[PDB]
A = this chain, B = another copy of it.
Amino acid sequence: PFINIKLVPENGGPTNEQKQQLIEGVSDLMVKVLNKNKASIVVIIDEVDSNNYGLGGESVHHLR
């Protein structure tokens, strides 16, 4: 299975350690809930600039 996560960096995060936790956690979720093979799981994390992510018509930067 493929998992794509797009998030807006906030207050000095995410760190490489938190990224690892996200990767391992979503991966284990597929195993425990769907009994999937862990080795074939691909996860990609995209960090979006605050000025390029909109929620409810406003940029997250504006909202911040």
**Residues of chain A at the chain B interface (Cβ within 8 Å):** 1-8, 10, 13-14, 16, 18-30, 32-34, 36, 38-48, 51-59, 61-62
Contacts and interface: CB of A to CB of B under 8 A. Distances in A.
B3 A4 contact: yes
A29 to B, nearest CB: 5
29 contacts: A1-B6, A2-B2, A2-B6, A2-B7, A3-B6, A4-B5, A4-B6, A7-B30, A13-B34, A16-B51, A19-B51, A19-B52, A20-B51, A20-B58, A21-B33, A22-B29, A22-B33, A23-B57, A23-B59, A24-B58, A25-B29, A27-B56, A39-B56, A40-B55, A41-B56, A41-B57, A44-B53, A45-B48, A46-B48
